[PDB]
């Protein structure tokens, strides 16, 4: 898929808030 965090960040996608770096 597309990155949830690109360069440490919060980068909003489906399953990004489930993924480990931006776990919101």
From Swiss-Prot:
User: Gene Ontology terms, cellular component aspect?
Assistant: extracellular region; host cell postsynaptic membrane
Sites of the modification Lysine amide? 24
State the disulfide connectivity: 4-16, 5-21, 10-22
Q: Where in the cell is it found?
A: Secreted
**Which tissues is it found in, per the record?**
Expressed by the venom duct.
Q: Which domain of life is it from?
A: Eukaryota
Q: Keywords, A to Z?
A: Acetylcholine receptor inhibiting toxin, Amidation, Disulfide bond, Hydroxylation, Ion channel impairing toxin, Neurotoxin, Postsynaptic neurotoxin, Secreted, Toxin
Name the principal localization, coarsely classed: secreted
Q: Which family does it belong to?
A: Belongs to the conotoxin M superfamily.
In UniProt terms, what function does this protein have? Psi-conotoxins act on postsynaptic membranes, and act as non-competitive antagonist of nicotinic acetylcholine receptors (nAChR). Is less toxic than Psi-conotoxin PIIIE.
What's the protein called, per UniProt?
Psi-conotoxin PIIIF
